[PDB]
Amino acid sequence: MFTNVKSTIRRVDPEALNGRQLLKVVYVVLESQYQSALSAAVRNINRTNSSLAIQLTGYLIEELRDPENYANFKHDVSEANLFIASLIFIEDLADKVVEAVTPYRDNLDAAIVFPSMPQVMRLNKMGSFSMAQLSKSAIAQFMKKFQDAMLKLLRTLPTVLKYLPVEKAQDARNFMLSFQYWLGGSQENLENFLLMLTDKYVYPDLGLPDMGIWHPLSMQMFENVKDYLEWYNQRPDISEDLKDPLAPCIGLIMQRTHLVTGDDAHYVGMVQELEAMGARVICVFSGGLDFSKPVNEYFWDEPLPIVDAVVSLTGFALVGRQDHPRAIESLKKLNRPYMCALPLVFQHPIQVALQIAIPELDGAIEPIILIALQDRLEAIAQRAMKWANLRKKPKLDKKVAITVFSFPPDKGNVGTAAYLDVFGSIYEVMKGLQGNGYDVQDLPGSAKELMEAVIHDAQAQYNSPELNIAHRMSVEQYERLTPYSVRLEENWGKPPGHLNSDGQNLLIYGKEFGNVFIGVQPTDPMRLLFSRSASPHHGFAAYYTYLNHIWKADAVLHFGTHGSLEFMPNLIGTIPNLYYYAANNPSWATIAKRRGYASTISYLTPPAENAGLYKGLQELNELIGSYQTLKDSGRGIQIVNTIMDQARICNLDQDVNLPDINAEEMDQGQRDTIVGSVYRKLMEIESRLLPCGLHVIGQPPSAEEAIATLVNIASLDREDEGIWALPTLIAESIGRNMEEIYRNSDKGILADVELLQDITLATRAAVAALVQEQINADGRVSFVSKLNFFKIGKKAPWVKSLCDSGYPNVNEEKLKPLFEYLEFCLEQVCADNEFGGLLQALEGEYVLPGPGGDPIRNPNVLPTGKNIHALDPQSIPTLAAVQSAKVVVDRLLERQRAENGGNYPETIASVLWGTDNIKTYGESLAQIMWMVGAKPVPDALGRVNKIELVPLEELGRPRIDVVVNCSGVFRDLFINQMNLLDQAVKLAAEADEPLEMNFVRKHALEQAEEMGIGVREAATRIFSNASGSYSSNVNLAVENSSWEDESELQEMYLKRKSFAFNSDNPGMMDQNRDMFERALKTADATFQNLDSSEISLTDVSHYFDSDPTKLISTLRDDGKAPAAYIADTTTANAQVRTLSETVRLDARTKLLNPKWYEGMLSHGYEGVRELSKRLVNTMGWSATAGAVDNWVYEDANSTFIKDEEMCKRLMDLNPNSFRRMVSTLLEVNGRGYWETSDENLERLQELYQEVEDRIEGV
């Protein structure tokens, strides 16, 4: 009394309730300090707060003995919103308090009991959270047995959050906050305590530092690191291991909002998990959108990073308009692994797609692949820790697993156009690692010797090829270290199964070379299955079990040669998952990043050469050469017959109209045109720029090897760099337009076919002159393009070349910035960063991010060795892409009309890929918008999120109906654009326009009647796979020859690609095969966009897998197969070729091109793999389209089988890939796609039997 101020008042009421809501609070307590603090808080809210007033009644527990006080207590409890109890340790009264409150536990918005006897504690209720949902017994028995007790229970609550759902966790966090306020005991602590409980559990429908450091267990935010670390080390609740500066430290980035809000549950649990694993945590926040500020201020201290890795939990970019250049600058200075987890993960398909894109431009790694927090929190924590372990662990101790897919290469699996010498690359990597201070033992003498170590007798010289066995896993070891193994059993029986098995154990295939391990994963018809839970075989798990738990890899390196786990509907583990992915493949790289926890260092594809002319095609060019001389002679007639006879022998009659009319019977005009047509088709072949070989990682191209790439870079207008194509500038100089020269060349007007070839040669010469000068300056000058040649009365060597080519008066002001750009590109093509990129990932550093794409169309794809990203899926299509889409559509329709009575088609069936739409900023996507006469509409910021019909006035022709077959990859990246596409089709169907100007409405009306639905539901045209599915599986079927008739292929297409996107209900993608078949039934044409010359029709299986050409012929009433087109925008001269034209162009520039196949076979074993790929993909095209001329299979047999020298070379080089070549030819004959001599078939059936023996035994 004399030493502690007690109060006589037990009850506080507002003096005037006014308009305000009344909160009723009852308290039972022992401390007169907590009584008086609570009263003063209630008093202060009443006198100020203008929408809330509080009533407070309580008794010091001793007073509840009186029946006078207890009867009032019960009544007050009955009417009360909030019950509060603290330090209740009396048998008799505790029970009275339980009896009083127990009835109203439903009533009470919340009941908060602080350290008391266990009976009272069980009253605790705050939404979902009670004492039932705890480390329950841990505190329950300690509670039975001060300032300590309050702290013990407070330190527990963060540990509990992970085992709860997010809603039930935040209730637990609200309890924890309310406990922190109480221990505080300040009048403003207890004010906020009441205003918090009132705002979240009583009246939710009422009111309510720029950056710094936060910890759940600190009441105040830290404005500097010293203060924070000072506090961290004074923490008694943590091990000494955390305070040690050598401890792993992990930086978290979050938004202030969530701290201000108190909606921070998942952040608390993230902090708790990392600290539970012995990681020191620095959580930074910002009210702004520039998070580079807290990063630059709080993750440093001459100054050094004090963070081992960073996990962003904001869902945003680092900076911001969003600023990726400054974000990258900040993340590169720091030089640590930058990880990202969207808020959406904790807290629908359009949202995750729009958001996950943005951190990827910052070089984010995604420890969450796309019920309690535990699995997500453990995932981020473990994966963040293993990135730090890479940082800490010394080089000589670090273990690096390198995994290889499909060796020996037999079943296509699902090969990308990787253009990789896999063992060439591993060997270089391994040398790099040894020569850098990693512990590599027994490094082989060459790549061949390395392949030999891993695959015994790969070439079947002395024994059958036999994969090396690095370990034999017993069932005992598998089942113990593979807890999820039991789940696999459904599809593969008990371990070990029939794959990677010796019957007793599971086989891990690979070879240890010290701290580097080369492991191969080469992949049940001996077991009858009944379900749809497609799981990986025991062997496939066993491999990942070995790497993670037995050999204990610190990191794993993959190659993007095949689609493994990322395309299947946490076998990876927690260790860093590194990928060498081709720069030219951002879409698959994106899938790996999102489905595979991939960090994706980019590599360059072999420097492309012009495909050139050979044998018959070269003879034809020589004849055409003489034509101008033999005209001036006067004998310019009999040559045109020789030219036509040779064209016909080259099978170019299928590509140019070659009538059976002797040259005598033509005029000079329509003889020139015959020649001109043939010429531009040979120049199409000659000039096709493509890789003729494989890349070895860390082996870049010579300045000379780069000229052909530099030529095609020089041959595009670039508005965004203020530079024109060299061809453009050459034409302008002779008062011409390249658009006209290209169009007159497509017609075959010889003068312009020659002028095009002349401008090409001048362009090739001028770029070659820049490279030579750069070479024979040999470092002496910075940039030969910046040199001031006018000042010494000289012409630049490329202005000279132009003059010698016959083109003076080329605008030299416009040549200056162009040739400055070309030299900068040459530097990036020739840069050597790929292996450096890997060293940085393994040193636990930040790999520079950059754009995947086409290096020719977007040179920013260079240099390689970066962590490649797609792009913001709201940044496409651009105005340039929309404008460029109209030209291709006008050209497609022009050609469909010309070959069908002058009549527009009513429906075009099109495929949409992510890859080409990344590379072109939405060209093929904008082609489909323009078909129905829609345009994308970008908002002020420049996000394409809206779409509108264009008037028929603007369209110049009827709206064409469309069936849009979106790849699973397109859906995963660009579902936002599928949403726009569906909107546009349905606007079209609804448009008050005549049916003959609007084929979308025409079909929809007819279909609405037939099906008994509205015009809008009937105009369903946008399809893909079911969620988390990919391809029609027609690729698998062709690659495994596991099909009898074409109808099997057609069926699985109709089963798998009939999932309809709906803009009116996007979260639903319901199968709708009825609508699918009805739309396809109306299709007059099929259409795809060529990604690139290196990812063309024969280079991959994905194009034929999605081809509906024959399927349509089945579905139509007339049975009429549709015209099939392939757009090619890869050069400034966009062609819309037929499918058959493109397949021929491929066969002539690749499979049957000696430059191509000699180029590939110069790498040996892996060369043969490239040859069989094209033959197999060519077969697919026979099965889906029958677009393969018989001569392609004849010439293939002629070149590789009938030539006995080549035939022996291939079978010795690579028996597995050769058996595949021999299989394919027999199959295409056996299925009616290839007619050939009985001799030819006997030679094959014998060779098949030969190599069968080499690979299998006899």
TrEMBL record:
* Keyword list, A-Z: ATP-binding, Chlorophyll biosynthesis, Ligase, Nucleotide-binding, Photosynthesis
A Pfam family for this UniProt protein? DUF3479
Task: Give a yes or no for keyword Transmembrane in this entry.
Answer: no
GO biological processes: chlorophyll biosynthetic process; photosynthesis
Q: Which residues form the CobN/magnesium chelatase domain?
A: 180-1240
Task: State the InterPro entries in the record.
Answer: BchH (IPR011771), CobN/Mg_chltase (IPR003672), Mg_chelatase_H_N (IPR022571)
Catalytic activities: protoporphyrin IX + Mg(2+) + ATP + H2O = Mg-protoporphyrin IX + ADP + phosphate + 3 H(+)
Q: Please list the coiled coil stretches.
A: none
Fetch the PANTHER family from UniProt.
MAGNESIUM-CHELATASE SUBUNIT CHLH, CHLOROPLASTIC (PTHR44119)
From the Swiss-Prot or TrEMBL record, give the protein name: magnesium chelatase
* Organism annotation: Synechocystis sp. (strain ATCC 27184 / PCC 6803 / Kazusa)
Which gene is transcribed and translated to give this protein? Answer: chlH
